[PDB]
PDB file of C-alpha atoms in Angstrom:
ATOM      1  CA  UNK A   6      70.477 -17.228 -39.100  1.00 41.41           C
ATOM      2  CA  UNK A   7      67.553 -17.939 -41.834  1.00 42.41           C
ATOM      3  CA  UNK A   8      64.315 -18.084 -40.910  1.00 41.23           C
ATOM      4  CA  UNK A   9      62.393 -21.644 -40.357  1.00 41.65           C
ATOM      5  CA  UNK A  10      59.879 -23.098 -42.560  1.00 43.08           C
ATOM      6  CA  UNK A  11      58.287 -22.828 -39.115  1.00 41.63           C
ATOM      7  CA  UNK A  12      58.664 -19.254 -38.470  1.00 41.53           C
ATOM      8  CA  UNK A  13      58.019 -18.274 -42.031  1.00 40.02           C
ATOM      9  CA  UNK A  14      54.389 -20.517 -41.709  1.00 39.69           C
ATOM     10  CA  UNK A  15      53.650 -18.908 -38.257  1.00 38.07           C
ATOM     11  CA  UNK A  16      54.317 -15.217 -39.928  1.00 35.17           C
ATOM     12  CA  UNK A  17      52.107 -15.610 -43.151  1.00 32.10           C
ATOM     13  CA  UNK A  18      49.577 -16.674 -40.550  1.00 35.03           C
ATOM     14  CA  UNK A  19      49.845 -13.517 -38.673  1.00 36.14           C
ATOM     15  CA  UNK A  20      50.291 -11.412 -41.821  1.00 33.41           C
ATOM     16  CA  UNK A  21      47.472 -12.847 -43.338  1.00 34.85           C
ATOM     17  CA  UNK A  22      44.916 -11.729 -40.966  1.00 35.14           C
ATOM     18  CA  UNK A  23      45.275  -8.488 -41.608  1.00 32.80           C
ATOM     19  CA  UNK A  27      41.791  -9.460 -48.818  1.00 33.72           C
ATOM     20  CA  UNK A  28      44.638  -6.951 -49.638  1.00 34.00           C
ATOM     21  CA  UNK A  29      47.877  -9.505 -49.863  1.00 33.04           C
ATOM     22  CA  UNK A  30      50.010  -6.647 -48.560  1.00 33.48           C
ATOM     23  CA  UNK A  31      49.838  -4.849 -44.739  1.00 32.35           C
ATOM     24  CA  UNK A  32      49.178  -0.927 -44.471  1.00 32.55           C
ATOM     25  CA  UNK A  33      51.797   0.783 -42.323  1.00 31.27           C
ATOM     26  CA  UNK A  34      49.434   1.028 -39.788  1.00 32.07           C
ATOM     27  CA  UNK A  35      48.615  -2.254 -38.965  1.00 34.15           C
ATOM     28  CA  UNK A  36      52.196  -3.130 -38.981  1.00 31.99           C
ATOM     29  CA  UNK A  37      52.857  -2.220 -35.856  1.00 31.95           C
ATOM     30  CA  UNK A  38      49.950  -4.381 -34.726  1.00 30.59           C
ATOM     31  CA  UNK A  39      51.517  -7.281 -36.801  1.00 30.43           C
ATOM     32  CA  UNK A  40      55.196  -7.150 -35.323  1.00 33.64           C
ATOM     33  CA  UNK A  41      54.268  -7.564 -31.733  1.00 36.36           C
ATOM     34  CA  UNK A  42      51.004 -10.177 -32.409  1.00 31.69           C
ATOM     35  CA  UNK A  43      54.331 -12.477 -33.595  1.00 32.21           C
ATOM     36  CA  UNK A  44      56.347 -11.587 -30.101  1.00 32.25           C
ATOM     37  CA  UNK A  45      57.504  -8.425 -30.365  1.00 34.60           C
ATOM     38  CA  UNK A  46      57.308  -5.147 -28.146  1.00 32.28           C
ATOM     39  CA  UNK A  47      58.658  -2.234 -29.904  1.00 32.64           C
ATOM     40  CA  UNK A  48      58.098   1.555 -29.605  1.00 29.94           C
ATOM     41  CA  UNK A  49      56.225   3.651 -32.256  1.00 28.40           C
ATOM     42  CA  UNK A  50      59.582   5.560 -32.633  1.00 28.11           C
ATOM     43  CA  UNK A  51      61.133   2.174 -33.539  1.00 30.12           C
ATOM     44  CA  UNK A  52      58.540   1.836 -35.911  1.00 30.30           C
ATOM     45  CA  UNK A  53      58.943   5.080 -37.879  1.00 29.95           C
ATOM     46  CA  UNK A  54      62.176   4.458 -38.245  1.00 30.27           C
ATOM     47  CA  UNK A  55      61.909   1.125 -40.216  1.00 28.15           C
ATOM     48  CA  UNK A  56      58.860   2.673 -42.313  1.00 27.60           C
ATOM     49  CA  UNK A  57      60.738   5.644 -43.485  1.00 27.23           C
ATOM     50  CA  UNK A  58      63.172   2.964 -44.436  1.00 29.20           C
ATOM     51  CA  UNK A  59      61.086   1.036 -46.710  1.00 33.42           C
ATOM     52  CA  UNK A  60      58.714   3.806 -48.033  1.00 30.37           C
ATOM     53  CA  UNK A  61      58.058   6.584 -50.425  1.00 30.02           C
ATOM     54  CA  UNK A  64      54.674   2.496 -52.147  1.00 28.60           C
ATOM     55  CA  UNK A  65      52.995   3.280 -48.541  1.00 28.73           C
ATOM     56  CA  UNK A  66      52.301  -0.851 -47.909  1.00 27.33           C
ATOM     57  CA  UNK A  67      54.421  -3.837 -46.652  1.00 26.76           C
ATOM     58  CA  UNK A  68      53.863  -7.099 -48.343  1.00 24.47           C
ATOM     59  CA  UNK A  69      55.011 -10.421 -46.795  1.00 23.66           C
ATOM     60  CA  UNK A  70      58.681 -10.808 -47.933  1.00 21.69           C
ATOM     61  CA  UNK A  71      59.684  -7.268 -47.114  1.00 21.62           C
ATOM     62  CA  UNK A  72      57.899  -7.627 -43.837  1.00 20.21           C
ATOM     63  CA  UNK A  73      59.744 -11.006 -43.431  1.00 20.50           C
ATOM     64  CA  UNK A  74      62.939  -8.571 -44.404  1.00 21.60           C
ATOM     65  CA  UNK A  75      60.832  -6.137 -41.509  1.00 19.25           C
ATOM     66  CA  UNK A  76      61.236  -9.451 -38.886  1.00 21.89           C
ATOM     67  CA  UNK A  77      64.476  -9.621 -40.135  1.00 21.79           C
ATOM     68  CA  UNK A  78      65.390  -6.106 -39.649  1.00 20.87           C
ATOM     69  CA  UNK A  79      64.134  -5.528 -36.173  1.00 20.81           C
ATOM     70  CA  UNK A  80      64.693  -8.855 -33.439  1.00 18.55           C
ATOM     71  CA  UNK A  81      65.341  -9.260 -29.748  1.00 19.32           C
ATOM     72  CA  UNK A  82      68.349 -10.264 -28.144  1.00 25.15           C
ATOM     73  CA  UNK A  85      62.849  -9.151 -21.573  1.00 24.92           C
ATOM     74  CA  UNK A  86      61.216 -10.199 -18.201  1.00 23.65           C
ATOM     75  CA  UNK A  87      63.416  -8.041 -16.140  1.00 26.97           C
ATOM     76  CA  UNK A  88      63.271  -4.803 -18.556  1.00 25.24           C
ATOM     77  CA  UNK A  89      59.755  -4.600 -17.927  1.00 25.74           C
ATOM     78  CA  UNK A  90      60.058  -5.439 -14.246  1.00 25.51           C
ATOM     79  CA  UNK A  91      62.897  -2.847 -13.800  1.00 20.48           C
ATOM     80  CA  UNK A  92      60.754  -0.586 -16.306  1.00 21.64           C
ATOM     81  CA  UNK A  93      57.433  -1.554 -13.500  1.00 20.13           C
ATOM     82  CA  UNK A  94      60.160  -0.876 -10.334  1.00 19.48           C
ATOM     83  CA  UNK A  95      59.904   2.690 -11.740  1.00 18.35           C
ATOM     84  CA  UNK A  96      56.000   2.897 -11.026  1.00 18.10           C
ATOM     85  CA  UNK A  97      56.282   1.178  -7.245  1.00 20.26           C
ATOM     86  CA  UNK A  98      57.022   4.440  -6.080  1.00 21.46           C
ATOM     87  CA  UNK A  99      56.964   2.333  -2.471  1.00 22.15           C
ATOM     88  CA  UNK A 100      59.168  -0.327  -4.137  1.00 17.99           C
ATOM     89  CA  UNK A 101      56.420  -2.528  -2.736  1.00 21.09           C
ATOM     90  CA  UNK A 102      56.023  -4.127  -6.021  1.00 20.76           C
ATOM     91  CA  UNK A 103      52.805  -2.196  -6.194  1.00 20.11           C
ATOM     92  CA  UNK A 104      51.470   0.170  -7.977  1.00 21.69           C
ATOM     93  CA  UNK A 105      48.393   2.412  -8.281  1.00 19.28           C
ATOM     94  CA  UNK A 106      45.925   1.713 -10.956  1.00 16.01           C
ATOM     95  CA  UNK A 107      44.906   5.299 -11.367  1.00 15.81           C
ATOM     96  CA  UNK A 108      48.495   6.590 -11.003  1.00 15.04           C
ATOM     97  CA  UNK A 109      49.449   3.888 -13.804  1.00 20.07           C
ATOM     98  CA  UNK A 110      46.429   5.499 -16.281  1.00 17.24           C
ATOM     99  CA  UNK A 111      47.708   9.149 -15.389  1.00 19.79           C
ATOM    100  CA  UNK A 112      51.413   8.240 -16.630  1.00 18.34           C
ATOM    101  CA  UNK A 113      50.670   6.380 -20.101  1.00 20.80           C
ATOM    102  CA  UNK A 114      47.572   9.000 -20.748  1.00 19.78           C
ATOM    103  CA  UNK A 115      49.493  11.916 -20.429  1.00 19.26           C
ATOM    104  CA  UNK A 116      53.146  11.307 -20.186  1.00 17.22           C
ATOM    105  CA  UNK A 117      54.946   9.377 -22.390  1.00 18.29           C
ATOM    106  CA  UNK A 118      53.663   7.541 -25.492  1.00 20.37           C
ATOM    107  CA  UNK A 119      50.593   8.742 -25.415  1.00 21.17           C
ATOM    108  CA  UNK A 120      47.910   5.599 -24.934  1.00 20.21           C
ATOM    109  CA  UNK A 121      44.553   6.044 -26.137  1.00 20.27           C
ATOM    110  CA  UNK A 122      41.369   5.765 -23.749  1.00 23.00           C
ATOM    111  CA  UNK A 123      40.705   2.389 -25.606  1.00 25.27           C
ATOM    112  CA  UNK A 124      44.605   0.869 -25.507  1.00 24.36           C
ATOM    113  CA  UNK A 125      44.553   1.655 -21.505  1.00 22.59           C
ATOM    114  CA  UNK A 126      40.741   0.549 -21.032  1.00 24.08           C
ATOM    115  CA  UNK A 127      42.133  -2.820 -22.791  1.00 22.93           C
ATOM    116  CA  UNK A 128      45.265  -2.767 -20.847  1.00 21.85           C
ATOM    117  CA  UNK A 129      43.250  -2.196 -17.910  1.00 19.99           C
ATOM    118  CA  UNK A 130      40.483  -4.400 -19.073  1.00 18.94           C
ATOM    119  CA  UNK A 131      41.600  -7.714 -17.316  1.00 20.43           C
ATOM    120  CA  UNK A 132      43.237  -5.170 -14.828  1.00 16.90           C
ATOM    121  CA  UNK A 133      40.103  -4.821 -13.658  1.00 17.69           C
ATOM    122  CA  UNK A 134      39.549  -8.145 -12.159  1.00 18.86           C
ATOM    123  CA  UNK A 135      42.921  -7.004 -10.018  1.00 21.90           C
ATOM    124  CA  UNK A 136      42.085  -3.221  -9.333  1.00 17.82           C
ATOM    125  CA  UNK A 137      41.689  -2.713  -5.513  1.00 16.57           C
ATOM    126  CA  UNK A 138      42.419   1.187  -6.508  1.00 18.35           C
ATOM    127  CA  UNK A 139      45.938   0.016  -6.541  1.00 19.16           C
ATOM    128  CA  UNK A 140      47.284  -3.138  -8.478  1.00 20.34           C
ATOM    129  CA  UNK A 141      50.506  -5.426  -8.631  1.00 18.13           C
ATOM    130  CA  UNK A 142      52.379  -5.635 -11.383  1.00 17.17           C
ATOM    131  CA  UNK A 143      53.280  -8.852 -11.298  1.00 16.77           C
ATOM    132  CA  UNK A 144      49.744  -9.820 -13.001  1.00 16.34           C
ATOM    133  CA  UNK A 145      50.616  -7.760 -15.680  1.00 16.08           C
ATOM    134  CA  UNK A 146      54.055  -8.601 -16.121  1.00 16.49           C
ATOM    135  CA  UNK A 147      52.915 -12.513 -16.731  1.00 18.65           C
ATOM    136  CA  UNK A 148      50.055 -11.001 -19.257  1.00 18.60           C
ATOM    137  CA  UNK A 149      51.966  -9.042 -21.183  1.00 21.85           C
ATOM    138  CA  UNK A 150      54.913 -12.046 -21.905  1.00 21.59           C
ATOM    139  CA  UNK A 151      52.381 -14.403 -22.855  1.00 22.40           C
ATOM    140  CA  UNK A 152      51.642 -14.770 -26.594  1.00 24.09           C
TER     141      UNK A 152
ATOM    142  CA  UNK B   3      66.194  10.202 -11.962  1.00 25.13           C
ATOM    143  CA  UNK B   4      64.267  11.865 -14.859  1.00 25.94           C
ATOM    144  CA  UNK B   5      65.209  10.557 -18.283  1.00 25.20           C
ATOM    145  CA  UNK B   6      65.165   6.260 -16.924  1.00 25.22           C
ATOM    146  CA  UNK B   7      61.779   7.015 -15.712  1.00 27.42           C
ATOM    147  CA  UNK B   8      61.066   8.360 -19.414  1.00 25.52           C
ATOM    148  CA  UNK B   9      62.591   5.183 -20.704  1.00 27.02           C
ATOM    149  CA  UNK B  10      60.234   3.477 -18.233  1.00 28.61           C
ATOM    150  CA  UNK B  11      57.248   5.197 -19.303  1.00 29.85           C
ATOM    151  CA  UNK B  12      57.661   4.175 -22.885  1.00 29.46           C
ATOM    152  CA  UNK B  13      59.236   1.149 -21.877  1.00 31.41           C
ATOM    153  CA  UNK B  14      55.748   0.053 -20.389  1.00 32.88           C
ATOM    154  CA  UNK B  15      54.165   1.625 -23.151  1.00 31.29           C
ATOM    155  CA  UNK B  16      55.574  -0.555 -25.946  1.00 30.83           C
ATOM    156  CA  UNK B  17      55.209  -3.724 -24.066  1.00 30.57           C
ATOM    157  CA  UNK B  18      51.529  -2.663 -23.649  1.00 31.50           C
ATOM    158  CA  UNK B  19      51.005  -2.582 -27.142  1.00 35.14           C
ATOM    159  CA  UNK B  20      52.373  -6.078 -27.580  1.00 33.63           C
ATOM    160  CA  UNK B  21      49.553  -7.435 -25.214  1.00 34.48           C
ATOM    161  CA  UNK B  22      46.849  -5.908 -26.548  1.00 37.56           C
ATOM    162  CA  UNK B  23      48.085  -7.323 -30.199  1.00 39.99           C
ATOM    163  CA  UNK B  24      48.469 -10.790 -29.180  1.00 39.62           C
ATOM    164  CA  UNK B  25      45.136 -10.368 -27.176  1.00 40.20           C
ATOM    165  CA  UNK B  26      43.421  -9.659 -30.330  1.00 37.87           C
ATOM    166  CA  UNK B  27      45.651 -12.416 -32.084  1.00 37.46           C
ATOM    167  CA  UNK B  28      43.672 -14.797 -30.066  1.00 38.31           C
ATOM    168  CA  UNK B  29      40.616 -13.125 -30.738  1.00 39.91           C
ATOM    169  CA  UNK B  30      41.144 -13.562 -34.846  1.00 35.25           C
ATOM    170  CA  UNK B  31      42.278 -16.732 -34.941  1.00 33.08           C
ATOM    171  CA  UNK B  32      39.448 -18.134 -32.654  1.00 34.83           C
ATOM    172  CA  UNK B  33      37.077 -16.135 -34.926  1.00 34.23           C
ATOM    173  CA  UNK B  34      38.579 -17.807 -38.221  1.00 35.42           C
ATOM    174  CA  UNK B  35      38.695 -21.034 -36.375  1.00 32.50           C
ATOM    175  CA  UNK B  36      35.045 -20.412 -35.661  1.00 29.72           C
ATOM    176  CA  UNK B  37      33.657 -19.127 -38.807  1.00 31.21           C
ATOM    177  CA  UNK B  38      35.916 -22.113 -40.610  1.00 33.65           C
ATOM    178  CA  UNK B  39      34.772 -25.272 -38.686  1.00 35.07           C
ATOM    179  CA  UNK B  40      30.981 -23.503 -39.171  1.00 33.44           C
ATOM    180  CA  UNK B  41      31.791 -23.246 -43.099  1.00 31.92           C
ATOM    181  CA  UNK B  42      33.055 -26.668 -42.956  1.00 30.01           C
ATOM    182  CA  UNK B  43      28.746 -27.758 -41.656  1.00 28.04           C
ATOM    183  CA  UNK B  44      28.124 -24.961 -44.078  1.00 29.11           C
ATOM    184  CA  UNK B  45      29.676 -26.641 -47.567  1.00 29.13           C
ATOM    185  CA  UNK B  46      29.717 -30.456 -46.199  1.00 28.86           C
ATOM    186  CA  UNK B  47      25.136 -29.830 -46.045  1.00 28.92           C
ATOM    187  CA  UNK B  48      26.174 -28.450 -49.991  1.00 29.18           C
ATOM    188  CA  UNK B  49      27.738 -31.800 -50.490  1.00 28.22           C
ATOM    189  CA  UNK B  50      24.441 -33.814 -49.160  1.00 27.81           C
ATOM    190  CA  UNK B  51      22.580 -31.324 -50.645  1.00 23.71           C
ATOM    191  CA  UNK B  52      23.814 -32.671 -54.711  1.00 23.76           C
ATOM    192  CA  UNK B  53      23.579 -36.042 -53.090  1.00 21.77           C
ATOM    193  CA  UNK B  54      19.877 -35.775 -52.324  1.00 19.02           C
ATOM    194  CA  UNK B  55      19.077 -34.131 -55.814  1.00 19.87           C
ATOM    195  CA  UNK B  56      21.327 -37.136 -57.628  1.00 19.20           C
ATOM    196  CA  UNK B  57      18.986 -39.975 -55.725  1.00 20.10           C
ATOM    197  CA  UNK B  58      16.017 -37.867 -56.955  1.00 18.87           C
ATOM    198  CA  UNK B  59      17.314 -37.720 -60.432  1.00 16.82           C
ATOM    199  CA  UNK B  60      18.156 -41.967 -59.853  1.00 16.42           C
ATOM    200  CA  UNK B  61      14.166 -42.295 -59.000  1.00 15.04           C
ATOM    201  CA  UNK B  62      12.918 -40.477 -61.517  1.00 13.03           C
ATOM    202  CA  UNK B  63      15.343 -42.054 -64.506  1.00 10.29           C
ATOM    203  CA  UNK B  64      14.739 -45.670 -62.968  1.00 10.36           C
ATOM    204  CA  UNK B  65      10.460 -45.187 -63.488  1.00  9.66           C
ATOM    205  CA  UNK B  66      11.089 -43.701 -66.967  1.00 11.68           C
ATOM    206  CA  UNK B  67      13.752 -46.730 -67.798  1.00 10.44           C
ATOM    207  CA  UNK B  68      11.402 -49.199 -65.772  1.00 11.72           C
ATOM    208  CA  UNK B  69       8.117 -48.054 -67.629  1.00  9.87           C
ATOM    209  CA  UNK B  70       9.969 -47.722 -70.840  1.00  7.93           C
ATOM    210  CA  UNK B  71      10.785 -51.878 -70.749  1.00  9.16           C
ATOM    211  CA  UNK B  72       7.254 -52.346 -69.774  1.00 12.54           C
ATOM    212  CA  UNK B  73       6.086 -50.801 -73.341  1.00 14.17           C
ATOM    213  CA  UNK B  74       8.058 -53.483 -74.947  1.00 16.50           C
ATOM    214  CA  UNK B  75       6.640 -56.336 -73.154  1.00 19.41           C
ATOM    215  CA  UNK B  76       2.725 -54.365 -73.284  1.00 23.21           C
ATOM    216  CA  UNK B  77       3.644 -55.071 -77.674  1.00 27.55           C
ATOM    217  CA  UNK B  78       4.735 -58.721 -76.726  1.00 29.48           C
ATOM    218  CA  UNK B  79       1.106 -59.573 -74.919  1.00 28.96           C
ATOM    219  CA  UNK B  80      -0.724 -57.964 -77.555  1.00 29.30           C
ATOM    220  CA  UNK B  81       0.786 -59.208 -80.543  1.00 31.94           C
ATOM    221  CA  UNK B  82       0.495 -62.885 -78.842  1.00 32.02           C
ATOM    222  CA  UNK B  83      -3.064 -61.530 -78.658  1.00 32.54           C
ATOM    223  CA  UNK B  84      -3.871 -61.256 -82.223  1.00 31.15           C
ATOM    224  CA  UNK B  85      -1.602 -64.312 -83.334  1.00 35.72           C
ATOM    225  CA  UNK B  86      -3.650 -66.147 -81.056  1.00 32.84           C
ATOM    226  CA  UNK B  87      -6.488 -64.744 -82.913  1.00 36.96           C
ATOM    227  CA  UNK B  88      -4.794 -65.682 -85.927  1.00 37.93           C
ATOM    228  CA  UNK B  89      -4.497 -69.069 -85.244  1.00 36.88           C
ATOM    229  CA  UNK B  90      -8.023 -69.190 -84.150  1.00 37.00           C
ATOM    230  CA  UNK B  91      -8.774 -68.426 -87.512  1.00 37.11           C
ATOM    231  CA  UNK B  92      -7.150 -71.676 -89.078  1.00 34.40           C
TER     232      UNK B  92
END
């Protein structure tokens, strides 16, 4: 399916933001998920390679970019979360939480978990529920 | 055990980044909204601003034009002056 007049006026918004006219590669991460998407940085190298030799995405190849990559949710993240409540509580440590995206995995920055964290901190009790988060993060 | 918890780590990872994004979303768009609706006071006071210096410009044409029809009728009194004179001399 073609995108709506709709969706096409709610992405030139977003792509907008970021006077150039055209998006480094960079911030194009940052643009994909502020429309409603959550993908990995190896997702992301993938399409840039594709699309790449240039080093910028202007709005109709990053419409072809929203085009590209789309989602076919809630549970993958809770399921993802159900990993971290060691317990199965439906807890999870604050602390322990920093330690995993720090170190292990893709590696957060002191800033992106301070900012996760950030409004985590009106939860932390040393430990903190997920469920907070899980109704943060699907929010646009 | 090892390589879903991997999944999970990224997993949480990528949908962190997606907060954070639309978290600062918000935070542009407010800050356009903000800066625009300020920019709005900021060119509609340019607007009054021309409209104040036109009314000036109207004062300051209608003394010249006023004063300018009063030169006319200054000739009229005085040339009824001296015709008057005139006539006082037959």
């Amino acid at each position: 399916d073609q995108l709506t007049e709709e969706q096409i006026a709610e992405f030139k918004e977003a792509f907008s933001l970021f006077g150039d006219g055209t998006i480094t590669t960079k911030e194009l991460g940052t643009v994909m998920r502020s429309l409603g998407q959550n993908p990995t940085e190896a997702e992301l190298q993938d399409m840039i390679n594709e699309v790449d030799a240039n080093g910028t995405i202007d709005f109709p190849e990053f419409l072809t970019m929203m085009a590209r990559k789309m989602k076919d949710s809630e549970e993958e993240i809770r399921e993802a979360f159900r990993v971290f409540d060691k317990d199965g509580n439906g807890y999870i440590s604050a602390a322990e939480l920093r330690h995993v995206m720090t170190n292990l995995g893709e590696k957060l920055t002191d800033e992106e978990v301070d900012e996760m964290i950030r409004e985590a901190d009106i939860d932390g009790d040393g430990q903190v529920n997920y469920e907070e988060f899980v109704q943060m993060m699907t929010a646009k | 055990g090892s390589r879903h918890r991997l999944w999970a780590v990224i997993t949480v990872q990528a949908y962190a980044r997606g907060m954070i994004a639309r978290r600062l979303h918000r935070r542009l768009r407010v800050e356009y909204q903000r800066r625009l609706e300020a920019e709005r006071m900021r060119l509609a006071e340019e607007e009054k601003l021309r409209k104040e210096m036109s009314a000036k410009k109207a004062k300051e044409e209608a003394e010249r034009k006023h004063q300018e029809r009063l030169a006319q009728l200054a000739r009229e009194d005085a040339e009824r002056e001296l015709k008057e004179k005139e006539e006082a001399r037959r």
